[PDB]
Amino acid sequence: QGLAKSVCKATTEECIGPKKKHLDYLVHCANEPNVSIPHLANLLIERSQNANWVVVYKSLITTHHLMAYGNERFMQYLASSNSTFNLSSFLDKGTGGMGVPGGRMGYDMSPFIRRYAKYLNEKSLSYRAMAFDFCKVEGSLRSMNAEKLLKTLPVLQAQLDALLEFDCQSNDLSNGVINMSFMLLFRDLIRLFACYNDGIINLLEKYFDMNKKHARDALDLYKKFLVRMDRVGEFLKVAENVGIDKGDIPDLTKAPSSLLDALEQHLATL
């Protein structure tokens, strides 16, 4: 199978992000009904077990790319057959070429590899719980019904929380590998942010017609949402400073407290 060779070409030790050509080939393969998704996943998982942080991170970036740009086949597998990454203890302190030193790159990249892998596994978990990819919304948060909304927001929120745990500073984004991952995280965040907002507008529309327990659930979810928009604001700030088009940066607006005041008063009278 051309797979193996292709997975290796996209996950080479060269310290730059996987090349568009290879990512495009793998996406082609991933959408083909006669190709073994399990096999392709195992090949990537195998590379994610490498000792070299560059190979690992690129394997994670390739998986993210397949998850966001190929059809669901690849994604459905990881979520169902629960095929996760196991990098919760990844650590690269052991730095060939022309004898070029890697310095403390492996060490400083390690936390990001961990957080990124964790977000990708959380992306799988989220799809396993919903049967669909929030970053592609079939399954409108805006129109969804109260009960469905309340079981959906906790899942969307957990996926967004895992993404924000990336928590990098501008000085951290210092090579082509981590830069590419941050770009892919940014694209997911924008989509996630939009779904979250839709879900919350919907929550507020149905809030006043909710019973007693559901009213309390919704109020909590709403407060959590407020905390998270500040976090998204900080993420976007960093996105702005590292060179991402301000035209692709959503213009957030502080939420009105009078509104939160209303939700609480209504809750009591209930």
Side-chain angles (χ1 to χ4, degrees), residues 29-47:
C29 301
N31 297 322
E32 159 53 16
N34 279 310
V35 167
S36 178
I37 288 311
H39 183 235
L40 169 60
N42 293 347
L43 278 178
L44 287 162
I45 295 300
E46 164 195 342
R47 297 298 282 171

PDB file of all heavy atoms in Angstrom, residues 29-47:
ATOM      1  N   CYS A  29      -6.803   9.044  -0.110  1.00  0.00           N
ATOM      2  CA  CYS A  29      -6.882   7.678   0.387  1.00  0.00           C
ATOM      3  C   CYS A  29      -7.964   7.515   1.441  1.00  0.00           C
ATOM      4  O   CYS A  29      -8.761   6.582   1.392  1.00  0.00           O
ATOM      5  CB  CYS A  29      -5.551   7.256   1.001  1.00  0.00           C
ATOM      6  SG  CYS A  29      -4.134   7.318  -0.103  1.00  0.00           S
ATOM      7  N   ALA A  30      -7.982   8.428   2.401  1.00  0.00           N
ATOM      8  CA  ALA A  30      -8.942   8.363   3.488  1.00  0.00           C
ATOM      9  C   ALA A  30     -10.400   8.381   3.047  1.00  0.00           C
ATOM     10  O   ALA A  30     -11.268   7.870   3.761  1.00  0.00           O
ATOM     11  CB  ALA A  30      -8.685   9.499   4.472  1.00  0.00           C
ATOM     12  N   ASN A  31     -10.684   8.971   1.890  1.00  0.00           N
ATOM     13  CA  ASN A  31     -12.063   9.037   1.426  1.00  0.00           C
ATOM     14  C   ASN A  31     -12.447   7.843   0.546  1.00  0.00           C
ATOM     15  O   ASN A  31     -13.627   7.596   0.302  1.00  0.00           O
ATOM     16  CB  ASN A  31     -12.324  10.364   0.691  1.00  0.00           C
ATOM     17  CG  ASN A  31     -12.158  11.590   1.604  1.00  0.00           C
ATOM     18  OD1 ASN A  31     -12.522  11.562   2.785  1.00  0.00           O
ATOM     19  ND2 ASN A  31     -11.618  12.672   1.051  1.00  0.00           N
ATOM     20  N   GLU A  32     -11.445   7.097   0.093  1.00  0.00           N
ATOM     21  CA  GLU A  32     -11.671   5.926  -0.743  1.00  0.00           C
ATOM     22  C   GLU A  32     -12.220   4.714   0.048  1.00  0.00           C
ATOM     23  O   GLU A  32     -11.548   4.169   0.930  1.00  0.00           O
ATOM     24  CB  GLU A  32     -10.369   5.548  -1.455  1.00  0.00           C
ATOM     25  CG  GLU A  32     -10.338   4.110  -1.940  1.00  0.00           C
ATOM     26  CD  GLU A  32     -11.548   3.749  -2.788  1.00  0.00           C
ATOM     27  OE1 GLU A  32     -12.254   4.667  -3.264  1.00  0.00           O
ATOM     28  OE2 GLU A  32     -11.789   2.539  -2.982  1.00  0.00           O
ATOM     29  N   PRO A  33     -13.456   4.276  -0.275  1.00  0.00           N
ATOM     30  CA  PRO A  33     -14.145   3.144   0.361  1.00  0.00           C
ATOM     31  C   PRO A  33     -13.372   1.817   0.416  1.00  0.00           C
ATOM     32  O   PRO A  33     -13.662   0.973   1.267  1.00  0.00           O
ATOM     33  CB  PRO A  33     -15.421   3.021  -0.465  1.00  0.00           C
ATOM     34  CG  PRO A  33     -15.703   4.435  -0.840  1.00  0.00           C
ATOM     35  CD  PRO A  33     -14.341   4.923  -1.261  1.00  0.00           C
ATOM     36  N   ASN A  34     -12.406   1.632  -0.487  1.00  0.00           N
ATOM     37  CA  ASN A  34     -11.612   0.401  -0.528  1.00  0.00           C
ATOM     38  C   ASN A  34     -10.318   0.468   0.276  1.00  0.00           C
ATOM     39  O   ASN A  34      -9.490  -0.449   0.218  1.00  0.00           O
ATOM     40  CB  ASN A  34     -11.273   0.018  -1.977  1.00  0.00           C
ATOM     41  CG  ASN A  34     -12.421  -0.694  -2.680  1.00  0.00           C
ATOM     42  OD1 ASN A  34     -12.988  -1.648  -2.145  1.00  0.00           O
ATOM     43  ND2 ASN A  34     -12.761  -0.241  -3.889  1.00  0.00           N
ATOM     44  N   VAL A  35     -10.134   1.556   1.016  1.00  0.00           N
ATOM     45  CA  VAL A  35      -8.936   1.716   1.828  1.00  0.00           C
ATOM     46  C   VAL A  35      -9.245   1.445   3.290  1.00  0.00           C
ATOM     47  O   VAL A  35     -10.298   1.840   3.803  1.00  0.00           O
ATOM     48  CB  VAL A  35      -8.342   3.129   1.680  1.00  0.00           C
ATOM     49  CG1 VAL A  35      -7.303   3.385   2.769  1.00  0.00           C
ATOM     50  CG2 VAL A  35      -7.703   3.267   0.306  1.00  0.00           C
ATOM     51  N   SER A  36      -8.322   0.754   3.950  1.00  0.00           N
ATOM     52  CA  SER A  36      -8.476   0.417   5.361  1.00  0.00           C
ATOM     53  C   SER A  36      -8.178   1.626   6.233  1.00  0.00           C
ATOM     54  O   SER A  36      -7.041   2.091   6.318  1.00  0.00           O
ATOM     55  CB  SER A  36      -7.538  -0.733   5.752  1.00  0.00           C
ATOM     56  OG  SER A  36      -7.658  -1.026   7.135  1.00  0.00           O
ATOM     57  N   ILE A  37      -9.215   2.140   6.867  1.00  0.00           N
ATOM     58  CA  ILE A  37      -9.046   3.274   7.733  1.00  0.00           C
ATOM     59  C   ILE A  37      -8.235   2.821   8.931  1.00  0.00           C
ATOM     60  O   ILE A  37      -7.304   3.502   9.346  1.00  0.00           O
ATOM     61  CB  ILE A  37     -10.404   3.832   8.178  1.00  0.00           C
ATOM     62  CG1 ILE A  37     -11.072   4.523   6.990  1.00  0.00           C
ATOM     63  CG2 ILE A  37     -10.228   4.779   9.354  1.00  0.00           C
ATOM     64  CD1 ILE A  37     -10.158   5.498   6.254  1.00  0.00           C
ATOM     65  N   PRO A  38      -8.573   1.653   9.501  1.00  0.00           N
ATOM     66  CA  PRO A  38      -7.823   1.161  10.660  1.00  0.00           C
ATOM     67  C   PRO A  38      -6.332   1.092  10.361  1.00  0.00           C
ATOM     68  O   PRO A  38      -5.499   1.522  11.162  1.00  0.00           O
ATOM     69  CB  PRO A  38      -8.435  -0.209  10.905  1.00  0.00           C
ATOM     70  CG  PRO A  38      -9.873   0.021  10.520  1.00  0.00           C
ATOM     71  CD  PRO A  38      -9.734   0.788   9.229  1.00  0.00           C
ATOM     72  N   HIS A  39      -5.991   0.559   9.200  1.00  0.00           N
ATOM     73  CA  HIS A  39      -4.593   0.467   8.833  1.00  0.00           C
ATOM     74  C   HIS A  39      -3.947   1.860   8.816  1.00  0.00           C
ATOM     75  O   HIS A  39      -2.892   2.058   9.400  1.00  0.00           O
ATOM     76  CB  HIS A  39      -4.456  -0.203   7.464  1.00  0.00           C
ATOM     77  CG  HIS A  39      -3.039  -0.414   7.034  1.00  0.00           C
ATOM     78  ND1 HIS A  39      -2.547   0.062   5.838  1.00  0.00           N
ATOM     79  CD2 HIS A  39      -1.998  -1.022   7.653  1.00  0.00           C
ATOM     80  CE1 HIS A  39      -1.263  -0.238   5.741  1.00  0.00           C
ATOM     81  NE2 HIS A  39      -0.906  -0.896   6.829  1.00  0.00           N
ATOM     82  N   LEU A  40      -4.590   2.819   8.152  1.00  0.00           N
ATOM     83  CA  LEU A  40      -4.072   4.188   8.051  1.00  0.00           C
ATOM     84  C   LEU A  40      -3.911   4.848   9.417  1.00  0.00           C
ATOM     85  O   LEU A  40      -2.968   5.587   9.643  1.00  0.00           O
ATOM     86  CB  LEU A  40      -4.994   5.050   7.177  1.00  0.00           C
ATOM     87  CG  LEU A  40      -4.755   6.567   7.159  1.00  0.00           C
ATOM     88  CD1 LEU A  40      -3.374   6.877   6.652  1.00  0.00           C
ATOM     89  CD2 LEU A  40      -5.789   7.236   6.264  1.00  0.00           C
ATOM     90  N   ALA A  41      -4.836   4.564  10.319  1.00  0.00           N
ATOM     91  CA  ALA A  41      -4.800   5.114  11.655  1.00  0.00           C
ATOM     92  C   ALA A  41      -3.639   4.497  12.422  1.00  0.00           C
ATOM     93  O   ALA A  41      -2.894   5.195  13.120  1.00  0.00           O
ATOM     94  CB  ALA A  41      -6.091   4.823  12.355  1.00  0.00           C
ATOM     95  N   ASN A  42      -3.485   3.185  12.293  1.00  0.00           N
ATOM     96  CA  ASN A  42      -2.400   2.501  12.986  1.00  0.00           C
ATOM     97  C   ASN A  42      -1.037   3.020  12.536  1.00  0.00           C
ATOM     98  O   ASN A  42      -0.126   3.153  13.348  1.00  0.00           O
ATOM     99  CB  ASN A  42      -2.485   0.990  12.766  1.00  0.00           C
ATOM    100  CG  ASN A  42      -3.709   0.380  13.424  1.00  0.00           C
ATOM    101  OD1 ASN A  42      -4.377   1.023  14.244  1.00  0.00           O
ATOM    102  ND2 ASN A  42      -4.010  -0.874  13.071  1.00  0.00           N
ATOM    103  N   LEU A  43      -0.909   3.313  11.246  1.00  0.00           N
ATOM    104  CA  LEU A  43       0.337   3.840  10.711  1.00  0.00           C
ATOM    105  C   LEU A  43       0.659   5.176  11.367  1.00  0.00           C
ATOM    106  O   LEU A  43       1.805   5.437  11.736  1.00  0.00           O
ATOM    107  CB  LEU A  43       0.235   4.023   9.198  1.00  0.00           C
ATOM    108  CG  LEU A  43       0.480   2.766   8.367  1.00  0.00           C
ATOM    109  CD1 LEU A  43       0.303   3.093   6.897  1.00  0.00           C
ATOM    110  CD2 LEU A  43       1.892   2.245   8.621  1.00  0.00           C
ATOM    111  N   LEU A  44      -0.355   6.026  11.509  1.00  0.00           N
ATOM    112  CA  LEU A  44      -0.148   7.318  12.145  1.00  0.00           C
ATOM    113  C   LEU A  44       0.113   7.138  13.640  1.00  0.00           C
ATOM    114  O   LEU A  44       0.954   7.825  14.207  1.00  0.00           O
ATOM    115  CB  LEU A  44      -1.365   8.227  11.920  1.00  0.00           C
ATOM    116  CG  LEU A  44      -1.492   8.770  10.490  1.00  0.00           C
ATOM    117  CD1 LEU A  44      -2.914   9.271  10.238  1.00  0.00           C
ATOM    118  CD2 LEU A  44      -0.488   9.874  10.286  1.00  0.00           C
ATOM    119  N   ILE A  45      -0.621   6.235  14.280  1.00  0.00           N
ATOM    120  CA  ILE A  45      -0.439   5.985  15.709  1.00  0.00           C
ATOM    121  C   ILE A  45       0.989   5.473  15.932  1.00  0.00           C
ATOM    122  O   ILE A  45       1.672   5.905  16.864  1.00  0.00           O
ATOM    123  CB  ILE A  45      -1.487   4.964  16.233  1.00  0.00           C
ATOM    124  CG1 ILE A  45      -2.882   5.569  16.115  1.00  0.00           C
ATOM    125  CG2 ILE A  45      -1.220   4.589  17.700  1.00  0.00           C
ATOM    126  CD1 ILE A  45      -3.055   6.857  16.905  1.00  0.00           C
ATOM    127  N   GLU A  46       1.440   4.576  15.051  1.00  0.00           N
ATOM    128  CA  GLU A  46       2.799   4.030  15.114  1.00  0.00           C
ATOM    129  C   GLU A  46       3.817   5.189  15.127  1.00  0.00           C
ATOM    130  O   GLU A  46       4.712   5.216  15.968  1.00  0.00           O
ATOM    131  CB  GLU A  46       3.064   3.116  13.906  1.00  0.00           C
ATOM    132  CG  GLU A  46       4.536   2.813  13.659  1.00  0.00           C
ATOM    133  CD  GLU A  46       4.815   2.218  12.268  1.00  0.00           C
ATOM    134  OE1 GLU A  46       3.876   1.713  11.604  1.00  0.00           O
ATOM    135  OE2 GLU A  46       5.994   2.248  11.840  1.00  0.00           O
ATOM    136  N   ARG A  47       3.676   6.140  14.203  1.00  0.00           N
ATOM    137  CA  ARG A  47       4.583   7.288  14.146  1.00  0.00           C
ATOM    138  C   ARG A  47       4.467   8.171  15.382  1.00  0.00           C
ATOM    139  O   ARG A  47       5.432   8.819  15.772  1.00  0.00           O
ATOM    140  CB  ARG A  47       4.305   8.162  12.913  1.00  0.00           C
ATOM    141  CG  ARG A  47       4.519   7.483  11.565  1.00  0.00           C
ATOM    142  CD  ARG A  47       5.962   7.035  11.366  1.00  0.00           C
ATOM    143  NE  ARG A  47       6.848   8.133  11.006  1.00  0.00           N
ATOM    144  CZ  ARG A  47       8.176   8.032  10.950  1.00  0.00           C
ATOM    145  NH1 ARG A  47       8.756   6.872  11.239  1.00  0.00           N
ATOM    146  NH2 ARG A  47       8.922   9.078  10.605  1.00  0.00           N
TER     147      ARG A  47
END
